[PDB]
Every structure is written in structure tokens, then in C-alpha cells.
């Protein structure tokens, strides 16, 4: 590692990077040999001038672009590896310093450049001696003999000789101290060489059992699941408002409205209606963001962490034990089928207004026609209106959840029909949100219009009576803290249309493939297991229910739903296999339903899917 005393520090520093010495056989020796060659080049090219220019310029151990520049001016070019060490301007010839232990082997290396062979002990080859001046020979001899006692002082002889003999070889070295560290947690050496004789033992295994009947998913028991989604969904309604901006509609509603509670829940106190009215007034006077009132503490849970922690500390009793978290088991609520029916109800408006893309090829026309017909199928539906409401609400909630405001913000859920009339779906109420992480929950006070009131379906929503020009509507009011990522992903709820579109598109294109002409009007008969028996139904209705069920699976998405679907994909595949009159075999300890039954706890749509699966034939024979 230390620099030899006979080599200048500049040459050593230049050598430090010129080649990778540490990963080569016999390191710290090839570097010294190359330093010797560079020193020879420097001594030959030392303060010698010809035609007003230096006689020798060294093409070695310097930036390559300089070599190409100098060679370009000299009408010569050299590739990378046979690069001459130095070039003589007086004679217009190039040389490479090439040390050899033996001098008898003249061995002209190449015709591109001549060689300057100087042995280790000092004597030069006859050609290189007769082509160079006396002083160069003498001082190269001095440098080489000095290197000679440097070698013999630390007996570098044989490895220097083999360095001269041939090209470098790459090696990797593991030390003795690292080797002991490496073997602390293993029974073998660095290179494992077990003494066992290679063989494959014949282990006795079990048998493969056929799935003669499809598994039956376990329907759970307990209180019916409430409606835990962010918004009402199928039970949502809108209030028609005169055309104008959002502030105009809010002003109209606030001016013509009377509020009276009809059902007050313990989860959402009826006293938080003051916050909603104050925010309506604020957003009607042109200030979306308003100050904090006393009821906001209860409405948004201000300082609820500290007081609950204090209560827990005061009520502390017993001994520390490992945390046991319990997820309450719930059964299938009866309102899932009601939501399925209501979400399929036909609306007057299209509720899906997406700008048509351009058309240039005949292929583009087919795709646009299919998309337009799909929009016609699932557009004039309640589920489309709920999707639009969710899109608007999530976007308006997310756009105001970017700073760290400590004051209440108003995000009305207002949509506009093609005529221009505003539609009051509801309202979202941001609380003080000092959010720092995308996972953190932001307090909200969701106020929105019901269509029907059911205490069992909405145990936490407070119901109020609203009078708007001789028309009465219900008004939801629920306290909910909802995260940033969920609001972001619900701001793109329109992506749910892809899967029903995929199914409809594949059906239409299968018809197009079976015949030799696209139709775009085909509405075939889809056979399904409806109410246990097998009754067919039309494609337009089937796609319409698929959209509603996918929307419910999207707004109700959690570890339970994703685990249920992931572990039910293989059972769906097995059912298809048995439909094709095929045999399904399983290994010894195989209980596929156990992977699914663990995901059925309290999710309403997981329970609904499980009931739908159970209402299907178990054996196909």
C-alpha cells in the first residue's frame, strides 16, 4: 500500500486510479511496474525539444481525448489496447516501454509501433539503444537498477517476473478475520463441501382426494351489519335548485329551509346541526372556510385523543397483558338486496357525460360505438348517479385536504343537470385536519339527503326533516373520520365502469366473432342461477347489476373483501372446471373453504357474495 521510495508521489497518485490493482493477482506489483514504465517515459521525454516543440509526447496515463487530439494533428490513430506509451516527433515514430527479463527474445510485438525493451537490471535492447541517446540509456539504467535493489530488499522477485511475463488475472480475496465472522452461524465452511453421498430419499406421502362436492361457505351469525360506507349510496337523493353557482344554490337552500330532527342517534348528537347550518350560511356569504363554534368539539372530536387517554389512565387497573383485538361477527343484513334493487332503478338523465374521442379508422368507430352503447346501458341508472355523487364528494373533500387548516371547510356535493338546474346531493364538512401522513384520518361531518329512513340500516346517522318549497326530504348527519388515501381513490370512482364494460364488450365481441359482422344491437340471453334455480336474463340487465355489485364492492373494500375474493378465485375456477365435466383433486390437508371462511366476519357484501355462492348447486355430476 505504501509508495516505494524510488517512485515520485505524482506518479503514484496518477497510478492510484489508472487501473484496478486491488482485484488483480499479485497487487501492488503491477502498479509498481506500470509506474516504472511511466517513469521511463518521463525520463525519455524530459525537457527535449525538436522544431520548437517537445521531441517526445507520452500517450500514456493521461486523458484519452488528449491522445485523440494530438494524434489527429499528426494524421495517425491508435485503438485502445495497443496504445503507444510515447511518440517521437523528430522521427515520426511511436514507442511502447515494454520490460523483459530476458534480452535474447527481441520479439517484435506489432508493426503499428516499435518497442523499447529495457531489462530489470538495466541494459537496453540493441535497437532501442541505437535509436535513443546516451543520457536516456544511462538514466533509465539508473532508475531500473534502483528499482532492482528495491525489489531485492523485499524479495519481490518471482511475482515481478510473472507480472512481466503475462497479462493480469482477476482475483477475489477473503481474509482470515472475515472468514471466522462468516462461519459463526453455519455448520459448513465458506465453500460448503458436505461428505454426504448424493441421493434422493423415497419419502412416504399421502393420497390426493377428489373434490366431489363444492365447498359450502360458513354463513356467520350475529347482529346485522349496519351501512358503514362513507355515503348513503342507493338511498341518496338530490334537491333541484335554480341554475347558478354552488354559492347561489347554497344561499337558496339556506334561505328556504326548516330543520327538525326525526331520529337522533347516540353516535351523532342532534346538536351538531348547528355546525351544518353555520357552514351553509358561511358558504352562502362567500366564505367556504368558517371559524370554530362550541358544537364543533363534539362534531369533529377536538381533543378527543387527550381526554380518552386521560380517562384510560384514570381507569387503569390490573396487569399488563398482550393486546387482543376482537372483530365482532355479523350476519348478512337484509338491506343488501334492497340496495341491489334500488341501484338498478332507471333514471331520467344519462348521468355519464364523457367526451367522445376522435375517429380516424374503422377500428376507432367500433370502439366508440361500443363505448357509447355501454354508456346508454348503464347511464340512466341510479348507480350511475351515486357514482357521480361519490366522485364529486370525494374530489371536493380531497381538494380541501391539502394544507393544515384548523378551521372548518365546506365542500358541497352539488351536480348540475344538462338543463342547468343545480342538484343538492349533500354536503361534506372538513374539520381541523393537521394531517401529516396519507394514512391519517381527517374528521368529517357528512350531511346528505336520504330517500328512506331505516334505523337498523343507519344506527349512527341522525335524521332531520327538511322543508324546501312544500317538499319534504330527509337529511343524513353522521360523524366520520376518513383517510386521505381513501378520499383520493374514491375521487376516481368512475374507474369502476371498466369491469362491467369489459364483460359487455367481451360478450358483444364474442357474438361478432361467432358471426362475421358486428351488430352493436345484440342483447342475448344470459343464463344465471337466480333464486336457486337456473333462469336466464338479458345482457343489458346483467351488466346493470354487475355495475351495482362492483360499486358496492368498491365502496366496501377492506382486508376481508380482498382476502375473500383472492381465496374465492380458485373456488370459482373449480366450479367452472366441474361445469365442464372435469375432476378436481386436492392434496391431503386441503380445505380450500377454510382460506375463505376466515375472511367472512362482518363485511355485508362479503356475506352477500357468500350467500350467493351457497345458493348455487354444490355437485354437478
Amino acid at each position: 500500500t505504501d509508495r516505494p521510495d524510488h517512485i515520485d508521489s505524482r506518479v503514484w497518485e496518477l497510478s492510484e486510479t489508472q487501473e484496478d490493482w486491488i482485484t488483480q493477482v499479485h497487487g501492488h506489483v503491477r502498479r509498481v511496474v506500470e509506474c516504472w514504465k511511466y517513469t521511463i517515459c518521463c525520463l525519455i521525454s524530459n525537457m527535449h525539444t525538436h522544431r520548437g516543440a517537445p521531441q517526445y509526447d507520452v500517450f500514456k496515463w493521461q486523458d484519452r481525448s488528449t491522445i485523440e487530439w494530438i494524434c489527429s494533428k499528426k494524421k495517425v490513430q491508435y485503438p485502445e489496447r495497443d496504445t503507444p506509451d510515447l511518440y517521437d516527433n523528430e522521427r515520426a515514430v511511436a514507442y511502447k516501454v515494454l520490460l523483459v527479463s530476458d534480452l535474447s527474445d527481441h520479439s517484435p510485438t506489432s508493426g503499428i509501433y516499435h518497442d523499447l525493451a529495457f531489462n530489470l537490471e538495466g541494459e537496453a535492447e540493441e535497437s532501442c539503444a541505437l535509436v535513443l541517446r546516451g543520457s536516456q540509456l544511462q538514466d533509465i539504467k539508473g532508475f531500473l537498477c534502483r528499482a532492482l535493489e528495491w525489489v531485492v530488499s523485499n524479495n519481490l522477485t518471482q511475482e515481478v517476473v510473472e507480472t512481466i511475463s503475462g497479462e493480469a488475472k482477476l482475483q477475489f480475496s477473503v481474509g482470515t478475520t472475515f472468514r471466522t465472522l462468516l462461519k459463526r452461524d453455519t455448520d459448513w465452511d465458506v465453500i460448503p463441501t458436505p461428505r454426504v453421498e448424493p441421493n434422493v430419499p423415497r419419502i412416504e406421502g399421502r393420497r390426493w382426494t377428489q373434490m366431489k362436492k363444492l365447498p359450502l361457505l360458513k354463513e356467520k351469525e350475529g347482529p346485522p351489519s349496519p351501512w358503514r360506507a362513507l355515503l348513503l349510496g342507493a338511498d341518496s337523493e338530490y334537491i333541484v335548485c335554480p341554475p347558478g353557482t354552488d354559492q347561489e344554490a347554497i344561499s337558496w337552500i339556506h334561505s328556504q329551509s326548516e330543520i327538525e330532527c326525526i331520529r337522533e342517534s347516540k353516535s351523532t348528537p342532534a346538536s351538531v346541526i348547528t355546525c351544518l347550518t353555520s357552514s351553509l350560511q358561511s358558504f352562502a356569504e362567500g366564505n367556504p372556510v368558517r371559524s370554530r363554534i362550541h358544537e364543533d368539539i363534539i362534531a369533529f372530536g377536538i381533543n378527543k385523543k387527550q381526554e380518552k387517554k386521560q380517562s384510560a389512565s384514570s381507569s387503569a387497573s390490573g396487569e399488563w397483558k398482550r393486546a387482543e383485538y376482537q372483530v365482532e361477527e355479523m350476519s348478512l343484513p337484509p338491506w343488501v338486496e334492497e340496495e341491489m334493487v334500488l341501484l338498478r332503478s332507471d333514471q331520467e338523465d344519462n348521468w355519464i357525460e364523457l367526451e367522445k374521442n376522435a375517429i380516424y379508422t374503422e377500428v376507432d368507430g367500433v370502439a366508440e360505438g361500443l363505448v357509447d352503447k355501454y354508456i346508454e346501458i348503464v347511464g340512466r341508472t341510479k348507480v350511475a348517479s351515486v357514482i357521480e355523487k361519490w366522485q364529486i364528494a370525494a374530489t371536493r373533500t380531497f381538494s380541501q385536504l391539502h394544507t393544515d387548516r384548523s378551521r372548518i371547510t365546506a365542500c358541497p356535493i352539488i351536480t348540475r343537470d344538462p338543463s342547468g338546474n343545480c342538484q343538492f346531493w349533500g354536503m361534506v364538512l372538513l374539520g381541523p385536519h393537521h394531517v401529516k401522513r396519507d394514512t391519517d384520518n381527517a374528521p368529517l361531518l357528512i350531511a346528505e339527503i336520504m330517500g328512506e329512513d331505516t334505523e337498523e340500516k343507519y344506527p349512527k346517522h341522525s335524521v332531520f326533516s327538511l322543508k324546501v318549497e312544500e317538499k319534504q326530504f330527509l337529511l343524513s348527519l353522521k360523524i366520520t373520520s376518513f383517510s386521505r388515501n381513501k378520499l383520493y381513490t374514491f375521487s376516481n370512482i368512475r374507474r369502476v365502469l371498466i369491469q362491467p364494460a369489459s364483460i359487455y364488450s367481451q360478450v358483444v365481441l364474442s357474438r361478432a366473432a361467432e358471426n362475421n359482422s358486428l351488430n352493436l344491437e345484440v342483447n342475448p340471453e344470459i343464463q344465471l342461477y337466480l333464486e336457486g334455480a337456473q333462469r336466464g336474463m338479458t345482457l343489458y340487465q346483467w351488466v346493470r347489476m354487475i355495475l351495482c355489485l362492483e360499486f358496492l364492492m368498491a365502496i366496501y373494500n377492506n382486508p376481508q373483501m380482498e382476502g375473500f375474493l383472492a381465496n374465492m378465485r380458485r373456488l370459482h375456477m373449480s366450479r367452472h372446471a366441474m361445469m365442464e365435466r372435469r375432476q378436481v383433486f386436492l392434496p391431503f390437508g386441503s380445505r380450500p373453504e377454510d382460506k375463505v371462511n376466515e375472511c367472512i366476519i362482518n363485511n355485508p357484501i362479503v356475506a352477500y357474495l357468500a350467500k350467493g355462492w351457497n345458493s348455487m348447486p354444490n355437485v354437478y355430476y
Binding site: 486510479t17 459448513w188 384510560a312 397483558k321 381513490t489 392434496p587
Partner: protein
Amino acid sequence: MNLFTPLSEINPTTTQELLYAYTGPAPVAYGTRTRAVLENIIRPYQYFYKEPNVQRALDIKTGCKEPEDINVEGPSSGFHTASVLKLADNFFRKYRPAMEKLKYWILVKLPKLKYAELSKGRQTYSFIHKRNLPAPIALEETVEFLEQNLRRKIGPTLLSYCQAIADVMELDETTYEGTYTIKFSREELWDQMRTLNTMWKHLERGRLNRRTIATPSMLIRGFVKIVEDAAKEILENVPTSGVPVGGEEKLAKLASKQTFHTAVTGELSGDQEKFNECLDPDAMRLMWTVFLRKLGCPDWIMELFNIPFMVFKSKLADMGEGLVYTKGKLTDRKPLGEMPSEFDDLVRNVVGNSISCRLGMFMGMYNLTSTLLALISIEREELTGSHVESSDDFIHFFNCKTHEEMFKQAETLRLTLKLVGINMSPSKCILISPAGIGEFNSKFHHRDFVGNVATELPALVPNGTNPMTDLAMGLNVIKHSVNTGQMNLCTGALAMRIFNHAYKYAYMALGVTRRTRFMEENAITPLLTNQGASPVHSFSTMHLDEVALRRHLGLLDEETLRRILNPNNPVTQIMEDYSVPSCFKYTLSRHKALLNKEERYQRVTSIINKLFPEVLIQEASAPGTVRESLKRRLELVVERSDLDEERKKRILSRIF
């Protein structure tokens, strides 16, 4: 669920994509990972023996076990040594061309690997600041640490980096002086090298329970990179590997091969239960050693390939913030050992906040090497079928003559994977005897058709930055989705329309907005999609830039064309952008001891970017430091200028 099972005109497998949750929040993991990581660590000790004997099982250094110790009923952790030797020999004997490519990689491509590619990695725990950092920052920290401790300059090659890591370990004391100096011992540096930083795996789908992911340290990432490049080189040439290159043609071809009618077919689609926590690093050591020995590779190659797994056997997995303990309503965060729990067996392995774990592995590491361990097992004379392996998911094809012999082959497949520590899930593996219905990775196979089904829906939203680049990004993502078979005519066009609507809204151009109301009040007619005009793209036009289309169809005319593409515009003055520089190609407006270092590195990058025009086309390969290289290039570029020599020396006089 009966709605997702059509009985006519369309297959239940064709409606398989309805069983997904594209739209909807992906679950996020909350709180400590300590319980999850301790559960992951305890599994290899639980299933090492037929009966749970964790306390005695916490004495095994090499996971070698006798054949009668293998659990044929439940999961089995560990491997049979002679089985590994024979299976590796069989995997070498067949697929010999695949191993020939490995020889060329070792002899030619391996020495040319640079450690700069280590900066293109995940977040890496830094032993200097004891905190997660981006990969380039940790890489330069470690390189500087080695330079200060080894009194030498680290070579650009990856082999040089690994050699530096090897030699730094024999030093009794190591320092990182430089205002900020911290000491290390050989044991402390060894522990830091062994330490595996673990964190929750976020935004993961298809699971009820959250898993954790462990990442290596920069002291071992070079060795891991070498081994994984070798594993990828092998796997890219074997027919049985379902890695990103194999998943395209292998499954589709296996779904299209004809079979003799008298023969008996069969597909086994399944998942490997407890894949990460059952394999032992010594099995990979032994397989790699057999591979290198049968290639005639030198001993230093063997040592280089063996160091990563040997360090893995000494891993100190980071538990995390501790276990959760309750005293009624309040909760506390407590480490393992302070109070009794269900992981009291592993208390003796607690080293500081980390825990020792010899048996078993962790996810996020040695993904490709684990695939190799699952393919040497298939190399048996009884197993005459076709196998495709991709990490913990696999599909197998049986071509037999009798059902009994098919079941014998299936059981042989189940047990041969157990000889190396790979237990397929009993409740997740399904065998279809008559013909082809199966699933692999994300694809779903039915008869001659294989249909790729996406796990995550493409983000049909602008990716930020500017309208011109993210419009192209969205169109390219939709095109990629269509090309993979996930989408088609109508689905692709609908995704295009949804993305276009979100694009027009995301730049405040839909409805009555301030920008919009500005356009019709200044008589600024809209010409571009981001301006709210009609869309110029179509399904057949996802690969074309907007402005060229609008010029060709005569939308941007000519006068507006000159003005928007003027290079001297006030507003203005990277992998597949393919967008023109225009006025709409703008940008938006957005431990502390590192910021100045970032700015210094950025300025040195800027000076290199201009003086060296060749540093963008290829990688910087030139001996010397930045100072001398830049100075010599400045001198060279000045001396080649058209200026006379007196101006040349005038310019050179001010260089210092």
C-alpha cells in the same frame, strides 16, 4: 356471487376479472410490525420438526434434516443435503446451454459490473445515521466510509466494491470522521452489515393479514446484486422459470401443446405455503457451490457467491417498535422480553433491538435465487411433466397414461419440493385432470386461451408534471394495458375517455373555471386538449403526440403553431416522454446537513453535463478525479477553438 357465474355465451373464467377490487382503497398496515416479524421468525423454528419443539430447535446452525424428519402433513422447514446435491447435479446436467450463459456472464459480464447500479435501488438503512435513506445517498456514504477506512480509492467495478467490503472487515476499528465523527468496532460493523431493516408492505392487495418486507444494507447489497444477476442469467434461459421474461410465451405455449388422446393430462395450479419462512440459505449456498464446481469456476467465485447467504444466516432482523400491551383501555409499546408473550422462546436471540434468526428467510430478498431452488427439485426421473415457477406461485402440467401414475407424480412433486424447504399450500393447490383450466401469477387459462388479468387497475389520471408529458404517459399506460390483453376495443376506449375527463379536470379546464372564463373573455379560442378543446386522439392513436396530430389535421393552423413552439418562450426558457418542448411544457412550484451536499453534487453534475457531451450517451468511464478531468477537458476544448493562440493562453491564464 351467482351473478358472476354465467351459464351461457360466456365462461365463468371469462368473467374472472369481476372477482377483483381494482376500484376501492387498498388496505394499509397500522402500528408496529413487531408482531408480524416475530411471527415470521418463529415459523421456521416451529415447523423444523414434526412436532413443535422451538426451544430445542433454537440450536440448529444449518437447516439440514433427515428424510424421516420431513413433515409430509404440515409445513416443513429445512432441507435434505444429499437431496440438494443430487437435484443441483440433475439441474446442471440438463439445461446445459443455460449454464453455459452463466459461464460467459462470470468470465465477461461479471467483471464489468459497476457499483453505480447499486444506487438504482430501494430505500436502504444507513449504519451511519441509523435511518432509512435513498439508495444513491447510502451508496455514497458507504463508499466514502470505505475510502476513509481503507486509505485507497474504490474502483468503479462492483467486484472492487465487494473487495473493499471484504477488506474493511479485518480492521479492528473503523471511523467515519467528517463536525460529525462516529466510531465502530469489528463486532458493531458486523452487526450493522447483518442487520435487516424491516417495514410494513403497504398498498398490498389480496390478503387478509399484512406482511412485512426486509431490505439489505449497502454492505451486502453488492453481493446480493451479483448473486441475483447470476440467478437472473440462469433463469432467463431455462424453460421452467416464470420470471418477467418467461411469463409471456411459456404459459401460452403450454396451453397450446396438443396431447395424445389416450394420454391423461392435468394442471396443478397452486401457491407455496410459507414460502419465505421455510427455505434455508444453506440450500442456496449448496446449490450455487455445485453449479460453480461443475462449471470449473475458481474458488474466489465460490467465495463471492457464498458470502451473501452466509451473512444472511447471521441476520439480525429488526423487530420494530415493540409488542403492544394493554392495561385495560390504555396501551403501551414494549419490546420482546420485558413482559411474557407468545414469543418468549426467541428472547435468547434478542440483540439490542434486533433478533437473531438462522432458519428461514424474509420477503423482498433473494427472490430470484428462491426460484432456482424450486426448479432443481423438479429435476427428477419420475417428474416427466412441465413446470413453471415464479417466486412463491407455480403451475405444473402432467402428461401421463393412467390416473394412478399421475397421482404418483403429483405426490412426488409435492415431496421433492419439501426436500429443499418448499411446502405448497394444501388449500391453495388444485389439480384439474381432464384438460386445461388453471391460473398462474395473474393469467387465467381456459382451453387454448390464456387471459392476463391485472391486479391493479391502471391509474387513469395525469401523473402530474405538465399536461403534455402526462397526457402521453396516460396514453402509453392505456396502450400497455391493451397490449397485454387486459383491455380491448371498448374497455380501452372507455379508459381513454375516463382518463381524458380526469385530465381535463385536473388542469382546470372543464366546466366554468377561472382559466376557462379567462379564455372566452380574452377571445382565446381553445386549441389543445388541456385547453378544453375536442380530443384529437383515438383508440388507434395512442402512440402519437398531440401537436403533430393537430398540425396534420389542420387544427393548430400555422400562426398559433409558431407562437406556442417558440424556443425563447418565458415559461420554459424522461424515459418515454415523446413530447415536444412547447409553452405547455412547463413545471409547477413545490438531516438538514445533506441539502448543501445535494446542491454541491447538482452543480458538479451541471458542469460535467456541459463540458462532457459524451457523458449522457454512455456511462462515465475515465481514470482520474472530477477536478483533473474537467480541467483537462476545458484545456482541450479551448485549444481546439477557432480563436488564436494568444486568446488561448489568455483563457488558460484564468483557470484555477
